[PDB]
């Protein structure tokens, strides 16, 4: 009740007070061998609560519609960061950012993205936008148009949290997208969980039959990685390769 109010009130000032910060988690080729990108993740550096769990604040941000605004701040921040990195010879090939439903439905999104690209001058293909399937499904016809508007900018699109099973996977073919994520909840079952392993292989084979790139998230063990590599998963991310870390340390570490 009260605790809810503090949170909300805190969140409202947070942006203005520059309390939000980006952390970056590395992504690698399926071997484990080379860096393919960084995923930029929203964090909250609160002066008295410390670093605030995303699970606690993201929801509340979207319970008051601030989420789109912060999202747009984040996209911009990551593009800018990738520019700084690139001109500092830190060779991060691309940055991936999540999009909320509100941002996707925003007519001016895409306009902002062209502006941010122009400002920072980074190549379009160095930006990858990540959507859930549910965002696409609320209105498929509209998704088609909005996506085509984005793809025309030369950027890349990844989709996560999608139905598994031949059909839903197959129907993704109609969208102009580049990447499918394998959810961590299927990866933590690998290699010996029967269903989790079937689903992963299903996602990989289907993605490839659609000409999409596949990235596994939540990769923690060599066992998981093995399974994924031998079934030809394209990219990989998670504890095994590195946690989301501040820009400076990602900068130093991957320099």
Binding-site positions for 3',3'-c-di-GMP read: 25, 42-43, 184, 220, 239
Indicate the residue among 160 and 220 with the shorter CB distance to a second copy.
Answer: 220
One of 13, 33, 89, 192 touching a second copy (CB under 8 A): 33
Determine if 192 is a binding residue for a second copy (CB under 8 A).
no
Determine if 239 is a binding residue for a second copy (CB under 8 A).
yes
Positions in 204-223 near a second copy (CB under 8 A): 221-222
Check: CB of residue 62 under 8 Å from CB of residue 56: no
Helix (H, G, I), strand (E, B) or coil at 6: helix
Q: How far is the CB of 57 from a second copy (least distance, A)?
A: 13
Q: Which two tokens stand for residue 152?
A: 């025309």
Determine if 50 is a binding residue for a second copy (CB under 8 A).
yes
Q: How far is the CB of 252 from a second copy (least distance, A)?
A: 4
Distances (CA, A) of 118 to 71, 76, 125, 148, 153: 19, 11, 13, 19, 11
Which residues here bind a second copy, judged by CB under 8 A?
32-35, 50-51, 53, 221-222, 225, 239-243, 245-246, 248-249, 252-255
């Amino acid at each position: 009740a009260l605790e809810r109010l503090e949170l909300e009130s805190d969140l409202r000032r947070a942006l203005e007070l520059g309390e939000f910060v980006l952390h970056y988690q590395p992504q690698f080729t399926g071997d484990g061998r080379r860096l393919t990108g960084a995923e930029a993740l929203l964090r909250w550096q609160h002066p008295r609560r410390g670093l605030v769990p995303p699970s606690e604040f993201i929801p509340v941000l979207e319970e008051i519609g601030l989420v789109a605004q912060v999202g747009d701040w984040l996209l911009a921040e990551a593009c800018k960061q990738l520019r700084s990195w690139h001109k500092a010879k830190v060779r991060v090939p691309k940055v991936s950012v999540n999009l909320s439903a509100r941002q996707f439905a925003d007519g001016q999104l895409g306009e902002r993205i062209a502006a941010i690209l122009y400002e920072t001058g980074i190549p379009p293909a160095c930006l990858e936008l990540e959507l859930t399937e549910s965002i696409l499904m609320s209105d498929v016809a509209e998704a088609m148009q909005i996506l085509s508007g984005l793809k025309r900018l030369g950027l890349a699109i990844a989709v996560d949290d999608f139905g598994t099973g031949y059909s839903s996977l197959n129907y993704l073919k109609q969208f102009p997208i580049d990447v499918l994520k394998i959810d961590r909840s299927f990866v933590d079952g690998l290699p010996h969980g029967e269903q989790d392993a079937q689903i992963a292989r299903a996602i990989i084979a289907m993605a490839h039959s659609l000409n999409l790139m596949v990235i596994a998230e939540g990769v923690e063990s060599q066992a998981q990685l093995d399974f994924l590599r031998e079934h030809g998963c394209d990219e990989v991310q998670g504890y095994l390769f590195g946690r989301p870390m501040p820009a400076e340390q990602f900068g130093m570490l991957y320099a």
